[PDB]
Ligand binder design. Structure first.
Ligand SMILES: Cc1cc2nc3c(=O)[nH]c(=O)nc-3n(C[C@H](O)[C@H](O)[C@H](O)COP(=O)(O)O)c2cc1C
Length: 362
């Protein structure tokens, strides 16, 4: 059981490999997109995780694509997050903030100015996002067709990432995780199916990776490389974003580029919740040879598959999403091979304490 053994993740040391996956729960205060003491308690309950990766958190207001998702750009968000990180720390936890821009998985109604969300190109995501109705309840809404970012707008995106990482530092997060996966902004640049640009941010894989690597460089400069992790979903299809006809070659390009930055970790979202073809161990090996930091795998993992792959030297840690939702003490439960609380998927998004902080510990 390597699952319950320590792991150096950049600037911190996880005491086990059972990580809490970033889990959008859509419980933040609006207006302001502000983390709550309730979220503080949910994270504190889960403070035994080897590492908590927070719900995806906006780098900027423009980054917002979901109602109830928190930001890390405003003083009030920073103040609220400070309490939440202090709570995790009070329990001897560690927490990374996952930082995103949702790009075209967004809706004009929650964009600054009610304007179209931005992306690499002006192509609809053809999916839904989650807004809130007038009662504050989660509802699914078709995504708004995005605007193609202008060349001159790119440095601002980079700077939003850089600023959010400076904010994360101040807020007491131990690490940050760049959300370059699952069909979101960075992923929309990466993918040829969502990126049809003909400037230096589109076409070739080098151009498609350009933004994410600029982002990585700016955030490493801002804080420190050993504070920076990144989530990718470079193989398969995620909320309609395929990785193109050269997905494997392009991933490996991207991974080798990330490697040069000496970043804390590479987190792989391997499949959508609807599933997809598993990663081949061959691919896993190719990833592992290109990247020299922590590799976290995620996507319908069982303790048994995590042990398997960590034991096989292919990944360092596993991020559990839905089991962590349902089991605050997942670490102790996996450790003791205890039964797990039943999941209540109906309360994954939005709502309050119920299905959030009422899953019991052993
Ligand atoms: C309720 C829900 C919310 C999610 N929110 C995020 C998100 O914030 N950022 C992200 O990268 N992945 C998100 N994911 C995907 C998870 O991080 C994770 O990769 C997936 O849930 C792991 O699979 P598992 O639930 O079978 O363990 C979410 C998944 C679910 C079920």
């Amino acid at each position: 059981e390597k699952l319950f053994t320590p792991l150096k993740v950049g600037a911190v040391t996880a005491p086990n490999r059972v990580f809490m996956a970033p889990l959008t729960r859509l419980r933040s205060i609006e207006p302001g997109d502000i983390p709550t003491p309730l979220m503080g308690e949910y994270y504190r309950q889960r403070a035994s995780a080897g590492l908590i990766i927070s719900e995806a958190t906006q780098i900027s207001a423009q980054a917002k694509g979901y109602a109830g998702a928190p930001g890390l750009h405003s003083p009030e968000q920073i103040a609220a997050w400070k309490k939440i990180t202090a709570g995790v720390h009070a329990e001897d936890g560690r927490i990374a903030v996952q930082l995103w821009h949702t790009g075209r998985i967004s809706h004009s109604s929650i964009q600054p100015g009610g304007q179209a969300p931005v992306s690499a190109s002006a192509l609809n995501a053809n999916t839904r996002t989650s807004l809130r109705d007038e009662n504050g309840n989660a509802i699914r809404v078709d995504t708004t067709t995005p605007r193609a970012l202008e060349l001159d707008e790119i440095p601002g995106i980079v700077n939003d990432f850089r600023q959010a990482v400076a904010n994360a530092r101040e807020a007491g997060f131990d690490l940050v995780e760049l959300h370059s996966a699952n069909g979101y902004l960075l992923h929309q640049f990466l993918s040829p199916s969502s990126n049809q640009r003909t400037d230096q941010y589109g076409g070739s894989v080098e151009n498609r990776a350009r933004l994410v690597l600029e982002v990585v460089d700016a955030v490493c400069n801002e804080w420190s490389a050993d504070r920076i992790g990144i989530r990718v979903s470079p193989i398969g299809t995620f909320q309609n974003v395929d990785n193109g006809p050269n997905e494997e070659a392009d991933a490996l390009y991207l991974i080798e580029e990330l490697a040069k930055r000496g970043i804390a970790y590479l987190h792989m979202s391997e499949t959508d919740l609807a599933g997809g073809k598993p990663y081949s161990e061959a691919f896993r090996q190719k990833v592992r040879e290109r990247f020299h930091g922590v590799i976290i795998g995620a996507g319908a993992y069982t303790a048994e598959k995590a042990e398997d792959l960590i034991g096989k030297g292919l990944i360092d840690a596993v991020a559990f999403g839905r089991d962590y939702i349902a089991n605050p003490d997942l670490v102790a439960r996996l450790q003791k091979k205890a039964e797990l609380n039943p999941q209540r998927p109906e309360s994954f998004y939005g709502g309050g304490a119920e299905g959030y902080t009422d899953y019991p510990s052993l």
